Amino acid sequence: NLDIIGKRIEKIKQEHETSWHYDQDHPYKTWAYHGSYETKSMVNGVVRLLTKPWDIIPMVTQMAMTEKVDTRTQEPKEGTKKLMKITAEWLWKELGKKKTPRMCTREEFTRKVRSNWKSAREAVEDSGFWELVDKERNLHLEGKCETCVYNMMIWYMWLGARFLEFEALGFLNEDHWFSRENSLSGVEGEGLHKLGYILRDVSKKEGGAMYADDTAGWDTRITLEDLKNEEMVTNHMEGEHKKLAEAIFKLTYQNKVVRVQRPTTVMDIISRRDQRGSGQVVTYGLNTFTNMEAQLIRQMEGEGVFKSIQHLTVTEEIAVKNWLVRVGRERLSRMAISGDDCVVKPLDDRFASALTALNDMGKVRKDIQQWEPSRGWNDWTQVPFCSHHFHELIMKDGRVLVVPCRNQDELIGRARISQGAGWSLRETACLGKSYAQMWSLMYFHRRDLRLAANAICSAVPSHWVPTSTHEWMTTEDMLTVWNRVWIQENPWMEDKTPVESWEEIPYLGKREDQWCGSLIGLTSRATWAKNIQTAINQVRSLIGNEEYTDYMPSMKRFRR
Numbered sequence: 092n093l094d095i096i097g098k099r100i101e102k103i104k105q106e107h108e109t110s111w112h113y114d115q116d117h118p119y120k121t122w123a124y125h126g127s128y129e130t131k132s133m134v135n136g137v138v139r140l141l142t143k144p145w146d147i148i149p150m151v152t153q154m155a156m157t158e159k160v161d162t163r164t165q166e167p168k169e170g171t172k173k174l175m176k177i178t179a180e181w182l183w184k185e186l187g188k189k190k191t192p193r194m195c196t197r198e199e200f201t202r203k204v205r206s207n208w209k210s211a212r213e214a215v216e217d218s219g220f221w222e223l224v225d226k227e228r229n230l231h232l233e234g235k236c237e238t239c240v241y242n243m244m245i246w247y248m249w250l251g252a253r254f255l256e257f258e259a260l261g262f263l264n265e266d267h268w269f270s271r272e273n274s275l276s277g278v279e280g281e282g283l284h285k286l287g288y289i290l291r292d293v294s295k296k297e298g299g300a301m302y303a304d305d306t307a308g309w310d311t312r313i314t315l316e317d318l319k320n321e322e323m324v325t326n327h328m329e330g331e332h333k334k335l336a337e338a339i340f341k342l343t344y345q346n347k348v349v350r351v352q353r354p355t356t357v358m359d360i361i362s363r364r365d366q367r368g369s370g371q372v373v374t375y376g377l378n379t380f381t382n383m384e385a386q387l388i389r390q391m392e393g394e395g396v397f398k399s400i401q402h403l404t405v406t407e408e409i410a411v412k413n414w415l416v417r418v419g420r421e422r423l424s425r426m427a428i429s430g431d432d433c434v435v436k437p438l439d440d441r442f443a444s445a446l447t448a449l450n451d452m453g454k455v456r457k458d459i460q461q462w463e464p465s466r467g468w469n470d471w472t473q474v475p476f477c478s479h480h481f482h483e484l485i486m487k488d489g490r491v492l493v494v495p496c497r498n499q500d501e502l503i504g505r506a507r508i509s510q511g512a513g514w515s516l517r518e519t520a521c522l523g524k525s526y527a528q529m530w531s532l533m534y535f536h537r538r539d540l541r542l543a544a545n546a547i548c549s550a551v552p553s554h555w556v557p558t559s560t561h562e563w564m565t566t567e568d569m570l571t572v573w574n575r576v577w578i579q580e581n582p583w584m585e586d587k588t589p590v591e592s593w594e595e596i597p598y599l600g601k602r603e604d605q606w607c608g609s610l611i612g613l614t615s616r617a618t619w620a621k622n623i624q625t626a627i628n629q630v631r632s633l634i635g636n637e638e639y640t641d642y643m644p645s646m647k648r649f650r651r
């Protein structure tokens with residue numbers, strides 16, 4: 092405990108010796124309190140002016156306006172712990188069959204920060220920072236830590252600590268350990284234009300309903316035995332790397348020090364050995380891994396591989412092992428897993444009431460009573476995954492698009508928001524164009540979004556570059572990007588005949604469009620569409636005398 096966190100806690104106190112108070116009214120129960128010290132959503136006008144009908148839709152307008160953590164997690168039973176240890180060991184070996192753990196480099200880290208001290212870019216160019224890094228590094232090589240502290244305001248750490256995390260664990264993301272080709276259940280690097288096709292291929296598999304249970308506060312349900320099963324990745328490493336990775340796991344993940352803003356204003360220095368604490372990218376990879384593990388074990392319970400989680404017999408151990416060796420890869424292929432998010436098509440519907448292992452691992456389902464069986468989906472096109480559902484859409488030439496979709500109020504509401512301020516008009520315009528190009532590539536099938544996207548791309552200078560997969564982040568023609576993404580590079584499309592205009596590219600049915608939140612039918616929407624050139628001209632007049640393209644004639648109704 093304090094042997095590992097003391098040094099860090101001692102350093103912060105000395106740096107604040109003129110304010111160190113052991114507040115006795117601290118509100119912490121599950122987090123260890125060590126001491127305390129003294130401390131102290133913007134609208135995108137370009138998108139909003141070109142989406143006037145949505146100015147009166149509360150779902151859109153309210154998006155721009157504005158205890159689970161402090162909880163414990165019962166230690167799993169012995170049988171649960173063994174199932175998780177056996178499953179983790181087997182899974183790291185499978186992920187490692189065609190991959191080589193390796194250190195990520197100051198070079199790789201520098202290039203990344205220079206493509207998204209005052210900013211981190213300045214520090215990456217300052218040798219003093221790398222000297223501070225080297226000090227902590229050599230410390231980590233000793234099994235000690237000084238500066239690796241979680242800074243809340245999602246816990247931000249100091250860039251150097253982030254570098255050490257990347258150096259030791261960045262390979263999981265950088266080398267695509269959770270790609271579908273390597274993990275079978277994963278979807279890292281796939282893209283929204285591929286997720287629907289993946290869910291459709293899972294559907295193809297003989298089995299029961301498709302289950303998509305969300306966990307309540309997954310990061311808060313991350314146990315120590317979870318963190319120890321994740322650390323077994325180090326048993327595939329060698330030399331300095333092994334030691335470095337081991338230090339990240341022991342000193343920064345399995346023992347954490349955090350600084351929390353408390354108004355009553357003071358900063359509190361609290362610690363904890365349990366819960367997800369790491370970079371949002373390492374967090375994603377380890378969430379995927381431990382979710383894959385949990386869902387394989389839930390599949391084991393459904394299929395009758397183990398009778399009880401209280402304790403595992405030796406025969407039950409060999410059975411779990413033979414199951415993993417005989418059908419584990421097939422079982423992973425029945426899943427789509429993105430961090431804490433999952434879709435499982437099990438062998439049959441016994442999975443729906445196989446809840447003992449899942450509840451005992453602490454991965455308790457959200458919005459359903461603890462022992463109530465899961466409600467599965469009979470149609471892959473209604474399954475939720477990564478905040479979307481997926482439609483099957485037949486082109487006038489009989490080729491099949493599987494397209495991503497969500498409630499259109501959510502799409503329009505997000506595009507109306509800019510994060511951080513100090514934005515020039517030009518930068519606000521380039522963010523608006525990023526959303527419009529995304530809509531043209533992923534949501535072309537929604538009448539209002541194709542129209543609003545064309546309007547935004549007409550109102551913003553043709554050569555301005557979209558700012559902040561993301562194949563929509565380019566100045567290339569959007570039709571040529573469409574063709575590359577949906578035809579040329581689409582492994583589900585046998586016929587590679589390119590599309591010659593936007594009018595070849597279909598929409599959802601009018602009623603389906605309305606069901607997913609379209610405003611077609613409304614007189615507000617009809618007036619908006621009819622007079623769109625006037626809205627386009629309002630924004631052109633604000634930006635000024637620049638080179639503009641009219642993209643509206645790409646649509647049949649404006650092709651006049």
Ligand SMILES: O=C(c1ccc2c(c1)OCO2)N1CCCCCC1
Nearest residue numbers: 538600601602604605610611612613
């Ligand atoms: O016929 C239409 C319709 C109206 C305006 C449109 C449109 C379709 O496409 C572009 O502008 N509706 C609207 C709601 C859907 C069910 C059928 C009725």
Ligand SMILES: [Cl-]
Nearest residue numbers: 468469470473
């Ligand atoms: Cl259904």
Ligand SMILES: [Zn+2]
Nearest residue numbers: 236237238239
């Ligand atoms: Zn450290």
Ligand SMILES: [Zn+2]
Nearest residue numbers: 480496497607
């Ligand atoms: Zn939809």
